């Protein structure tokens, strides 16, 4: 088998060969067994929203042409897309809500493993929300912030403040004029599910406007999640670590944290240190915590925990034979891990009540008992390490160097070394003079349909040569880090001369004797909100709205409903937004035309659907350069 | 074409012949064009929850056997079912929330077309919720009730009170022990959408427990909707009217109200009276308001507005040529009505922001302007009547007599004429002595897969002969009313001797010189909550939980996600619950076993999946008789 057709990651290729000779079925094998996939679902021309279905519509030819109730292709496609947006927003809702409850418990004395670690961020958030801080105790300010977070989930006398206070007034005004500001996060999710049920909304434009509004509920959940996690766990600052499977160590207890909400896995990191001597008593060198997916990104950004792998290739960490435990919260966890565990000697542990996997051990995490829970979990991992005494393992000796931790605060701080009282100005100066052509945010997942990482790296390489400042989150950051795009030693090879000059100037003013890395890692999927903060700050500093800035986004290998929601809010806030896999819209030309063209007249953003990555890079560069021209800049 | 294979309603058959010769496509034609339907969707073995899909699993044979991410058939089936429950609950959320806002506006002086019409119900609801009434103005009590309603949508220091205050403490205790009490209505909807997204919950039992809890969020929305509509519009009492297409009048302006939330259509009824002389100036005899679907049931129950048709046959009202306007809110409206309108000369009008139909005129209803909006709408209808001057119409001269209005308060009042201070006792006496074998609630829709009404009438006939007290809501009530089951003149033919004796005794004590009708119409789909109130009151009076009572439910021709949610909460509160169409569960035996068998050990209720109505009636009778035996009663 030509494993490079499955993944461009050489460590993944090595583990695919091991899985093949050991007869362990992988995600790629399950994909092959699924082909050919249903074309009605692929194009969006299937509806199961009532028990008269399934209804399907032929993309072309003869009947069926319309759903049983009369729903047109337009309506079916838009309703399906809307439910995907609501599902994505629901995951942001759950993640942010859990942190809000954790912060409230911490300051009420109910969860002493948690605390206010970033008091400055707490006060800034409170100020942004309009909560008084002068003369108030930090615990009372934090209680008010947590109450405000919980209030944004339902209707009240204000709209969702984690939208209206984080975008510039001119953008809020555009959105309000179109009725797009969410009334409440869970309120919008429920309204989507209602309006898309049988015999309700049946006008494509009306449906899609509802979807844009629900996507902003996802944005609010993202921003709230980042805000609360920074209060609780610290705002990221620049870190150096490593990525890929070679970060596993045969002689250590290897523990992966996997999922998205790091609420317990930030605790796992701290407790794992305490238990070093206990792990050594078991014959290990220590506990080696490694990251998978967003939870991995969270602890990478804040603590420099090395990232083992991401998204589509997550099973491969287990195939090494050296993964003693995989500690799960929720989201993006292939449930195959529970069955593979029996073959590989990994202990798979679930921790959240609403995310269990048949066959995996469940340990009831509670903030109130977080240290206790962590010790129970890590002792299972130590037990598992002991059971593999004397078993060879196959860890690919493949890893990259990763500089990360570029929160928006960290980026502004780095720029302030060039201009202390106007830190965005050096960035803008270099956009104006062409040393920085524009900004591209890579976001979202890998997808088994695309050879792993191929779109991210192909597009990033062409943008970097054209002097684009590239920022990344989620498993887009994962793809780029595992291929060396976060190692400053690769700036000469990857970057155009103008971009190299800027990364070098900033790095040398931050005492590095060397440049910033080719790509700036801005964190997890909720931390796409950090990219919003940066872009909104640039818009404010320039006095223009986001749809005039040379800033684009690319969900180059999108998979999860979360990625559909993110792409939709990127469009809603004003960005040209590439998606590199086909969303289920091509069965309706009118819906496609709205999402790729006429939405420009509503929000200024628009989708760019392009599966060929070289072509996508050209289209993204054209979008950037069109924005440059609109600002009167050379390009 | 043998139209009796499509509908057992003879008026519908006549209009199907008219549609055929005029070349107007109907729901039945669109169904035929859809056959054969996809077996993966039919069985539940399809997933589109991420962009790696669609994934499908062969019910039997070879690969594919598992989803791409590892999701098993169990997981796929349970996730799909859970999303359907959440969608149903979301419609109850929207409906109830709109009424809560209407009540709040009314008592704040912001919507003078609305008012407190049932002060006694207001005070009783307040007492049930724990809101003080002594010394308080009605407007302040109502503000507190509306605030409490809105609070049940989100988490707070109490669970959802429209669950915990409406079921007996022993039932609440059972549900709480299993973690099934909702934390908030929209909170549960969002948690379902999260947990069912890719890489989250992947254990069938855990998923289905979440679904049971979300179904109780639907129950809360139903009960809240009924409570608030009774405050605003009056609690139903016994009414006499008519049903079927013969209620249309060629010489009148015929206006159908269609959808579910009657917030404007209760106003349409009152304003239509005011405009009699204006309609007469246009050459009509008056404005003839008629009902379709739940909104029709609402105005039938409160005002005796005749019901034109229901559910699957709704297009046939238009085919007569005499329907001048169809006034829509949301839910259960086939969007085909907008295109048929061009053929039939009907003006189709949408009124709610989140439910538009391409090609239909939209009129922006606002409580604040309700009378103004109603006049605008009715003037469009008058204009349309004038355009059909001199056009023949074909109204089938087919109608039945309907006695309805059996709210739980009305039933208790009727029984109190036999026992003033213990009004449930005469009902219980007759259950004990066998004159009443048990109670069956018919609920939910028609479904194009089932010859219209055939399951409702076949099952009802066999239960009535076996002395079952039959109550009905929604388009189950619609089916039964259109076939004479709400006409007391049919008691001799339909009812067993014991049931006849009871209906006669109650009727003769209420001054009727004649029995109650064979079936008691308890209202719209949210008014399934009234059946809960009756059953909970019987449980309380007997000192037993609902899972010991000889009470069953039947969604005999279910269609909408709403009907899936209702069936699931019927099971959750303890009832044997028949469903007469196949829900998408048969692709997983473990899920089927949970829903039809092992849930008995959790809630005491269970699904009975049976597509053959004679067999379903036997299974429902066996369920009733098993409950009788458990109470020590003869059967
Ligand atoms: S909502 Fe309409 S299109 Fe969808 S399954 Fe039901 S009948 Fe078919
Ligand atoms: S969630 Fe799993 S089963 Fe569903 S479409 Fe995605 S890969 Fe397939
Ligand atoms: S027909 Fe294949 S996704 Fe429904
Ligand atoms: S394969 Fe037909 S419903 Fe998906
Ligand atoms: Fe992610
Ligand atoms: Fe209904």
Swiss-Prot record, chains A, B:
Cellular-component GO terms for this entry: cytoplasm; plasma membrane
Annotated transmembrane regions: none
Essential cofactor(s): [4Fe-4S] cluster; [Ni-4Fe-5S] cluster
Gene Ontology biological process terms in this record: generation of precursor metabolites and energy; response to hydrogen peroxide
Keyword terms of this UniProt record: 4Fe-4S, Cell membrane, Cytoplasm, Iron, Iron-sulfur, Membrane, Metal-binding, Nickel, Oxidoreductase
Keyword Iron set for record: yes
List of residues binding [Ni-4Fe-5S] cluster: 260, 294, 332, 445, 475, 525
Cofactor comment text: Binds 3 [4Fe-4S] clusters per homodimer.
Function: CODH oxidizes carbon monoxide coupled, via CooF, to the reduction of a hydrogen cation by a hydrogenase (possibly CooH).
Family: Belongs to the Ni-containing carbon monoxide dehydrogenase family.
Protein name (database record): Carbon monoxide dehydrogenase 2
């Amino acid at each position: 088998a030509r494993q490079n057709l499955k993944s461009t990651d050489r460590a993944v290729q090595q583990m695919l060969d091991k899985a093949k000779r050991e007869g362990i079925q992988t995600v790629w094998d399950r994909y092959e067994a699924m082909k050919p996939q249903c074309g009605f679902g692929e194009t969006g021309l299937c509806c199961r929203h009532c028990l008269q279905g399934p209804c399907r519509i032929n993309p072309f030819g003869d009947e069926p042409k319309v759903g049983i109730c009369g729903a047109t292709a337009e309506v079916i496609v838009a309703r399906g897309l809307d439910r995907s947006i609501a599902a994505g927003a629901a995951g942001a809702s759950g993640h942010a809500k859990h942190l809000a409850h954790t912060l409230k418990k911490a300051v009420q004395g109910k969860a002493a493993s948690y605390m206010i670690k970033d008091r400055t961020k707490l006060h800034s958030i409170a100020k942004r929300l309009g909560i008084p801080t002068e003369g108030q105790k930090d615990e009372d300010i934090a209680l008010e912030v947590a109450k405000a977070a919980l209030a944004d989930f339902h209707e009240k006398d204000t709209p969702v403040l984690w939208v209206t206070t984080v975008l510039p007034p001119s953008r809020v005004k555009v959105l309000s004029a179109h009725g797009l500001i969410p009334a409440g996060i869970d309120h919008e999710i429920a309204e989507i599910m209602h309006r898309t049920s049988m015999g309700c909304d049946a006008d494509a434009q009306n449906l899609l406007l509802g979807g844009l509004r629900c996507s902003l509920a996802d944005l609010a959940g993202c921003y709230m999640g980042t805000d609360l996690a920074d209060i609780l766990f610290g705002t990221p600052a620049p870190v150096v670590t490593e990525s890929n499977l070679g970060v596993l160590k045969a002689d250590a207890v290897n523990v992966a944290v996997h999922g998205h909400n790091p609420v317990l896995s930030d605790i796992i990191v701290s407790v794992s240190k305490e238990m070093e001597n206990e792990a050594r008593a078991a014959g290990a060198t220590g506990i080696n915590v490694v990251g998978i997916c967003c939870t991995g990104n969270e602890v990478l950004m804040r603590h420099g925990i090395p990232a083992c792998t991401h998204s589509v290739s997550q099973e491969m960490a287990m195939i090494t034979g050296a993964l003693d435990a995989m500690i799960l919260d929720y989201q993006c966890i292939q449930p195959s891990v529970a069955t593979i565990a029996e073959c590989t000697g990994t202990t798979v542990i679930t921790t959240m009540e609403m995310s269990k996997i048949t066959g995996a051990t469940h340990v009831n995490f509670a903030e109130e008992a977080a240290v206790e829970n962590a010790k129970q979990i890590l002792r299972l991992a130590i037990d598992t390490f002991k059971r593999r005494k004397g078993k060879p393992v196959e860890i690919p000796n493949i890893k990259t160097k990763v500089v990360a931790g570029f929160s928006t605060e960290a980026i502004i701080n780095a720029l302030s070394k060039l201009n202390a009282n106007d830190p965005l100005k050096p960035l803008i100066d270099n956009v104006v003079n062409g040393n920085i052509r524009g900004v591209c945010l890579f976001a979202g997942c890998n997808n088994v349909k695309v050879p792993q990482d191929q779109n991210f790296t192909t597009i990033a390489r062409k943008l970097l040569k054209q002097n684009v400042l590239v920022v990344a989150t989620g498993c887009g950051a994962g793809a780029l880090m595992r291929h060396g795009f976060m190692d400053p030693a690769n700036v000469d090879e990857l970057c155009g001369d103008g971009l190299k000059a800027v990364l070098t100037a900033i790095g040398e003013a931050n005492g590095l004797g060397g440049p910033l890395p080719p790509v700036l890692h801005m964190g997890s999927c909720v931390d796409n909100s950090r990219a919003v903060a940066l872009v909104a700050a640039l818009a404010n500093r320039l006095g223009v709205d986001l749809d005039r800035l040379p800033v684009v986004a690319s969900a180059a290998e999108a998979m999860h409903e979360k990625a559909v929601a993110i792409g939709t809010w990127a469009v809603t806030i004003g960005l040209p937004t590439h998606i590199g896999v086909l969303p289920p819209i091509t069965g309706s030309l009118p819906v496609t035309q709205i999402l790729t063209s006429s939405v420009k007249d509503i929000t200024g953003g628009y989708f760019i659907v392009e599966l060929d990555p070289e072509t996508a890079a050209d289209k993204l560069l054209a979008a950037i350069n069109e924005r440059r021209a609109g600002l009167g800049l050379p390009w």
